[PDB]
Amino acid sequence: VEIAYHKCDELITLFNKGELETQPGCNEEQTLEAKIGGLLSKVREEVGDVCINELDNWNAPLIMATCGSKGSTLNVSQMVAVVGQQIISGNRVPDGFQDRSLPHFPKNSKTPQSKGFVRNSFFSGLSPPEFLFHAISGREGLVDTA
Amino acid sequence: DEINTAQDKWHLLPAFLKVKGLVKQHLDSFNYFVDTDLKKIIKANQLILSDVDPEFYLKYVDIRVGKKSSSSTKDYLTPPHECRLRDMTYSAPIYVDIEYTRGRNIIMHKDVEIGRMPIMLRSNKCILYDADESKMAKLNECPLDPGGYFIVNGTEKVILVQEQLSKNRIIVEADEKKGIVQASVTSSTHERKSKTYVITKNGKIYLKHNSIAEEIPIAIVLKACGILSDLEIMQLVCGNDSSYQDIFAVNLEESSKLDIYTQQQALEYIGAKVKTMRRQKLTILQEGIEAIATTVIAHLTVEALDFREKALYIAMMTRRVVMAMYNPKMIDDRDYVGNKRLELAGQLISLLFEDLFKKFNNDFKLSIDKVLKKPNRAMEYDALLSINVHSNNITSGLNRAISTGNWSLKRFKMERAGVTHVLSRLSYISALGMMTRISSQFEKSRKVSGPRALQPSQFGMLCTADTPEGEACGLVKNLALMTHITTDDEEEPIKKLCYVLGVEDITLIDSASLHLNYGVYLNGTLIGSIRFPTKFVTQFRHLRRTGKVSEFISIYSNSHQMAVHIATDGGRICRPLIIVSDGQSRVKDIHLRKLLDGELDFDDFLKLGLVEYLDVNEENDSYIALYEKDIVPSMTHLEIEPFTILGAVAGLIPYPHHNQSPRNTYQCAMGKQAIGAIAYNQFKRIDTLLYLMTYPQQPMVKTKTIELIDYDKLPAGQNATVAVMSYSGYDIEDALVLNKSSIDRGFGRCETRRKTTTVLKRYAN
Amino acid sequence: LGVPRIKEIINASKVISTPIINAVLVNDNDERAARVVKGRVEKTLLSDVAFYVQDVYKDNLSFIQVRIDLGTIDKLQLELTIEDIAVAITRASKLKIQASDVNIIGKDRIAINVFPSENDVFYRMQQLRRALPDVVVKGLPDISRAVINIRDDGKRELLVEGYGLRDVMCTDGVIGSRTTTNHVLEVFSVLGIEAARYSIIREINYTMSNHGMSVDPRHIQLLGDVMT
Amino acid sequence: KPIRGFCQRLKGKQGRFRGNLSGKRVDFSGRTVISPDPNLSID
Amino acid sequence: IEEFPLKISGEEESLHVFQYANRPRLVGRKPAEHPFISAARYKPKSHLWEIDIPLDEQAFYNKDKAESEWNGVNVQTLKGVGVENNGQYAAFVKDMQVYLVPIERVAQLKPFFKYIDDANVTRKQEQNRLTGSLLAHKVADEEANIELTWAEGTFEQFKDTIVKE
Amino acid sequence: MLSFCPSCNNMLLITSGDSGVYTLACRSCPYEFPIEGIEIYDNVDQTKTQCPNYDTCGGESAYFFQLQIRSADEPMTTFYKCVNCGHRWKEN
Amino acid sequence: SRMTVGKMIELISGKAGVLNGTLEYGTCFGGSKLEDMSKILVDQGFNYSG
Amino acid sequence: KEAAAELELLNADHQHILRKLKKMNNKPERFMVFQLPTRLPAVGSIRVHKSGKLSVKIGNVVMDIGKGAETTFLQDVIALSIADDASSAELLGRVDGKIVVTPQI
Ligand SMILES: [Zn+2]
C-alpha cells in the first residue's frame, strides 16, 4: 500500500510543474486520473490475492463462497485484506467544497487516501474520513434500485 | 489517575448537552417568539383609525401572555395530562392593554383578553419549566419526556422543521443550449418577489420580470440606473483585459445606436412597456412612474434613495454571468448545505398569527362603523363587550390551522400543506427520533437524482446514517449530536465599525475597479472594497472571538472570485470545535480539570476564546484536524469528538464502522419500530394504539451516545443467548428458530392496548 | 449502453443521443488516406487557418481583410489552393449575407465591399465582422466530431458521429460496401425496410448480450418483424 | 375547484388502476405471511 | 526619533470636494487638465451641482451638424450628486508641521444635456400620497435656481485657521 | 472597432459623409474624426526523376511513397520528395 | 453477502462483559479492544474467540 | 504567502508616503485627504518609528497606526469653498495624496 502511494505522489508532483505523455483521452488531469485509477486498482486486487491464497482450510467463508451459498471471493477479500476505490457516478468523489473533498485535507487535494480510497478492512475498522466516502457509495447504490 | 489530553475531550459533550438540551429548536425559538416577536408585531400596528365622527383613535400600549397584577400566573392552568384526557386544548389567555377615546373627550385604559393561544410544552410560560421529581408525581406525568410539542384537540401533533432555499442571495446556474441564468428572490414585509436574469441570444442579455412586460436591453436599464458615460460601464462589468470585452461590447453597441441617454428614453421606455397599473391613484404619469419603479420594482432589496448603490450591484450581477459565459464551470450549483438554510417554527407561527390579527382589525374597525353611521347616542363602549363575543376567530382560526396543516395567508398568499405531523409513540426512540429531523419542500421531480445522493459538505452538520428508506430517499435528513441553529442579531452596528477598520464608502470610490484586491460583501451587498485583506480578516475575527459579537457573523476569504464575505444572516447550522494557536491547542490540561471537578461549566470557554463555532462557507476556508496526535502546525482548528458525525438514532448500533452504510441505514428505520416501555406515566396513560414489553433489559454492549440520551434507563428488547449453526431446515433463508420452555418461562412477552371513544350529544330538539 | 438505449430503439424516435457511424476506408496504413478522409468531412477550419482578421477603412472604400496562413493547409490536409475557399466565401455570402464582390491579390487575402436606419453601413459591417470567422470551408454540415481508432487486432479504421450516412458513404476515399449506422429509422430512409429490420434486431441483440443472461435469438426476430 | 363528473370517472388509467380497478372484486381469496419447510414436497 | 506635529482646524464654512471620472492622466510633465468658465447652478441640500466647461471651435467641431439640430456651439454641461460620510479630513503641509482641515460633503461629477430633454419634447410635442424618490424629484425641479460666480484667489485661507492654535 | 470621444466619452460610430467622404462622430455631441482607422484580432527509399523545383537545384535524386487511394479501380497516387530542398510533392 | 463483521465481534465483547460482571462499552471509531477480551476469556477456561 | 506579500508592501508604503509627504512641503498648493474613525476620543501626531518604521498616535495612552490607500490614478480632485449660500466658490487647487488610518492593538 505504501509503495503504491509515493509512486502516485511522484506522478502528481509532475502534474502542474511538469510534462508527461498523455493518452488520447483528450485533456489534462484526466490522464493521471486514469493512471491513479489503474494503479490503485491492481494494487488492491493484488493485496487481496495473496490473502485468500494463504488462508486456512475448513474455514466457513471460503467454503461458502466456494460452492453455491453466498457471495464471491471478492466479498471475503474486502472483509479480511483490503478494500479500495469507492466510486460513484463513474468517477472519484467530486468535491463538495472548493477544490477539496473535506476540510480535514489541504487545499488542492490530488493525494491518494484524500479521495475515495481506504486502506483499511472491515475488520480493522475505519479511519474517520474513510467513512463518509463509503456512506456515499452506499447511499448512491441504495437510491438507485429504489 | 492523572488528567490526560485524550480523556477530557470526551467530557466536553456532557457539559455542553446538560446546559442546552438535545432538542434546542422548538424550545429556543418559541421562547424568542413570545417575547421579541410579540412586542414587535403589536408595534407594527398600534392604532386603529376609522373615518366618521369628529375624532376617534385607539391605541394598544402593551400585549402580554397570561401575566398581570400580583398573580404570578393563571390560578390553575390545565396540566399536560388532564388536557389530553378531556380532549381540551392546551392554551393560555392573551392579555392586552388598550386606550379608549370618545367624543366625550376621555383618555382611559383597561385590561382585556382578545383570545387564547396554544403554548408548547417545556416552555418558560408552561408549568413544567424547571420542575423536579415529586412535582411531576403530583402533576401525573413523566420527567423524561422530550417535550417541545403542541397538544390540541385530543391527541398531539408536532411542527416539523422545514428547509428553505437561500433567501435574498444571488445564485447562478448554467444550461445547455439557450444559455446561463441567475435567479434572485427576496421578501420585504408584505410581499415576496422574484427576479430572473436571462440571455436569449447573441450574448446580448435580457431582464425578465412579472412587473415589466417584455425583456429589457439591460444596457438601457443601467442608463436608468443613473449611469451615463458608457465606457465606465464597460470598465466596470468587464474592466481591464482578456476576452471579457467583445462579448458585452455587442449589447453595448446596438443598445446605444437606436436609443441612448441616461435620462430621457431610459425611463420612458420602461414605463410605456410596463404591465397593469393596479387602477387606483395611478396618475403620477411622467418619467416619475419609472422613478417609483426604479426603486420598488427595481428587482432587489437595495433601494433606498440613490441610483448609485443599485446600479453597481446590477452591474456586479452582470459581472459574474459573463465570466461563466466565456467558459464552462466557474458557477455555483444549488445542492449543498452552504447554499441552504433551515427555518425553525418560531418564524412560521409569527407569520400565521399576524394574519389573523390583521383580519380582526378591518372587521373591528367596521364593527364600530355601524353605530358610527347611526344618528344618535355616540358609544363609549361595546368595543369591549361586543368584540369579546366577536373574538375567538383567532382561537379557532389558529387551532384549526395547527390541527389541519393547511395555512391560509392573505399577505404572501402561500398555502402550505403537510407541515404539522402527529407524534408517533411506540418506543422511547421514536418520540425523540421524529424530532430533530429535517424536512424539505418542493424542488420538483422524483426523477432527478441531483438532490438525492449525499454530499461531502454534509459531514458533521447532519446525520450521514439515518434515512427513511422508501419512496422518499434523502429528501429528509437528521441533525447530529452537537449542532446549533443560528439566530438573527442586527445590521447597523457592523458597517460603521467596518469603516473604522479602514474600509471606505462606495460612493466616494471612483467606480471603475476590478483591480485592487478583494472587497467586503455584507449579506451579498458590495460596500467597502478595501485593500489589505490580511489585517482586515484577522483583527475582525479577534474582535469576535474575544470581546464582542460571538457565534455568528463569520468572515471568510474568497480566492478566485475576488471579494471577502461577511454574513450576519441567521437561520443556519453551527458546529463547535477547538482553536489551535501556533503549534499547540488552546485547551492545555489543567483548564479542563478545573472544569470537571467543581466548576467553570460551559460557555465560559467562549469568553476565554477556546471553543467556538464555524459556519457558512467559512468552514471551507478553515483547516480542521482529526486527533491531537495528528497536529501539524499549519492547522487552524482541531475537532473534539469525531464520533458525533452519526445522529442520535444511529448511536444505538455497536461498532458501526465495522459494517457497511446500507446495513446501518436499515437499522435506523427498524430501530424506531421496536417496542419499549416508553415512559413512567405509561400505565396512567390512555393511548389509541400501544405495544408493551414485560421484562425489558439493557444491551450487554452499550454506547457513549445511549447514556447521554438516557436510553438504557428505558431499553427496548430482550437480551438473550444464541448459537450460530446450521440446524432445523425450517431455517434456511432469512428465517430464525426459537426454543420452547425458554419461551414458556416467557420471552419478549408483549401487551396490546387500544381504546374506544363515544359521545352523548344533544340536538336542537 | 443500458436500458435507456433500448428505449431509444423501441420508441423509434427521429433523433437520438451520440449516433456513431462506422466506416471502412481502404486498407490498414498510418499515413495519407487515414488522416486525409479525417480532415475532409468535418466542420470549418476557416476560424483556425484564418491567421489574423483585419478590418480596414480607407477613404471611400470599405475593406474586410482576411489573410490565410499557408502553413496550416500544408500540414493539415485539405484539397484546394485559394479559389475554393473564395467560392466557399461566396457561399457564405450567398447564404446569410449578400452578393456584391470578392477580391484576390496575395497571401490569400479576401476583400469584401459593401454599400447601400441612418449610418447602416457601420451597423451592417459590425454584424458581418463577427459572423465571418464561422462559415464552413469544407466538409459537411453534420459531424460533431470524428475519431481514428485501432480496429480489431492490429488494423485501423474510423468511427463518426453524425446524421450524414450516405453523403459520407458517397464521400470518395472510403469503401462504402460494408458499413453500419445507428438510429435505425434513418437507415430506413436509405436502405429501407428489410435492411433496417436486420439492423434493429442486430443492435437489440448486441446491447442485451453484454450486461447479462440471454434473451435467445428467437424472441428478438419476432419483435423486429411485427414492427417492420 | 374542479367538479368534473363524467369524462373523469372513465379515466384513471394510471395510479390505483392496479389496485382499485382490477383489484376490487376477486372472490374466495386469502393473504398471509411466509415460512419455510423441508417436509412438503414441491407442488 | 523626531516629531511631526499635526493640528485640527476649525469650522471655516466647511468644504465641498469635486471629482470627475472623465479625464484620464495625460502621462506628460503635468498630468492634470484645468477646467474653466465655471457657471454652476445650486439649490438646498442634495443640490445636484452643475459644471460648465467651454468648447473650442478650432478642432473637429463639425458645424454642419450643429446648425441642423442643436445650436449650442457653446459651453459643455456637467452635473452630479452630492453625498456625505463622517470621519474624513483634508491635509496640507506647512514647514515642519502638518495642518488638517475637515472636508465634510463629497460629490461625483458626470455629464448630461439640456440639449436633450428640450429636444425630446419639441420632437414629441408637434396629490396627497407620495414620499421618497419622486419627493426628491418633484421638489428638485421646482426649487433649483442659483447663479454662483466662481472666483479663484487665496491669501487668508491659511492664516484664518493658523491663528486658531 | 470600439472607439471613444474625449470629453463626453461615449462611443464613435461611422457616419456617411456627403459626396464621397466617409467619417465618424460621437452621438448627440459635436465632433469629427480624421485619420486611417485600424483594428486587428487573433530515408532509405530513392528513385530517379527530374526535379521541378528550381533555384540552383536541378536535382536528379528524389524520394517516393506508395499508397492506394479512392476507388479500387482508381489508379495509384505517388508522393515525391526531393533530397536538397526537402519539398513534398503529390501527383497520381 | 450482507457483509457485517460488527455483529460477530459483539458476542465476544458481550460474553467477556458478563464474566467480569460489567457492562462492556463500544463505539464508532474506537472503544473497547477485541484483544483484551481474548485474554479475559482464555484464563477462565474458554477458547479465545467464540 | 499571505503575510509575506503584505509586509513587503507595508515596508514600501511606509516609505513612499513619507517622501511625497515631504516632497510637498513649502508654499505651493498641494492637498491630501484623510479618513479617520468617528467619536474622536482625545492631540498626538504622526512620525517615523525607530529603525525606519512609521507610527501614528494620539495622546493619553492610546496607539493608533495605519497608512496606505486604495488604488489612485483616476481622480481629478479639488475641494471648493461654499459659505452661507451666498456666492463663494473658492478653488484652493488640485490634490495630491490619499491615506487611511486603522486602529490596532
Ligand atoms: Zn463625443
Side-chain angles (χ1 to χ4, degrees), chain B residues 494-513:
Chain B
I494 189 60
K495 305 173 60 61
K496 53 170 60 180
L497 175 60
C498 194
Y499 287 140
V500 176
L501 217 151
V503 323
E504 70 283 354
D505 186 27
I506 192 181
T507 59
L508 274 80
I509 306 175
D510 151 58
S511 67
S513 341

Side-chain angles (χ1 to χ4, degrees), chain B residues 9 16 133 144 156 165 177 219 285 299 307 321 329 346 469 560 641-643 649 657 672 714 759 762:
Chain B
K9 286 187 174 185
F16 164 77
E133 298 304 320
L144 268 66
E156 154 266 353
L165 188 50
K177 279 78 179 181
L285 284 180
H299 310 103
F307 283 168
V321 280
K329 204 66 168 51
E469 160 64 24
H560 279 203
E641 305 181 22
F643 67 95
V649 189
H657 59 287
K672 58 183 60 179
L714 298 162
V759 50
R762 195 174 187 90

Side-chain angles (χ1 to χ4, degrees), chain B residues 461-580:
Chain B
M461 308 179 64
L462 289 170
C463 180
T464 62
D466 197 346
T467 290
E469 160 64 24
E471 179 65 28
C473 176
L475 298 182
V476 284
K477 306 175 182 179
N478 298 269
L479 304 174
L481 271 67
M482 301 186 62
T483 37
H484 198 278
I485 294 178
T486 309
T487 65
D488 195 87
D489 179 86
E490 198 54 39
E491 178 262 349
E492 189 70 19
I494 189 60
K495 305 173 60 61
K496 53 170 60 180
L497 175 60
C498 194
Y499 287 140
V500 176
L501 217 151
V503 323
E504 70 283 354
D505 186 27
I506 192 181
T507 59
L508 274 80
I509 306 175
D510 151 58
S511 67
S513 341
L514 274 194
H515 58 266
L516 55 103
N517 232 324
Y518 311 107
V520 43
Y521 294 173
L522 181 59
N523 300 333
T525 304
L526 194 156
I527 305 297
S529 176
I530 192 196
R531 189 62 185 185
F532 296 154
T534 305
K535 201 61 176 297
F536 179 75
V537 174
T538 304
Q539 290 295 123
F540 187 85
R541 188 181 291 103
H542 177 269
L543 296 178
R544 182 173 68 92
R545 289 158 47 181
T546 309
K548 201 175 181 298
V549 285
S550 63
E551 202 180 356
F552 208 61
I553 314 179
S554 180
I555 171 180
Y556 62 94
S557 177
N558 199 333
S559 180
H560 279 203
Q561 176 184 5
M562 233 167 295
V564 45
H565 303 264
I566 301 179
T568 182
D569 299 334
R572 195 189 158 87
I573 313 177
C574 320
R575 55 173 299 182
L577 38 79
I578 301 183
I579 277 178
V580 280

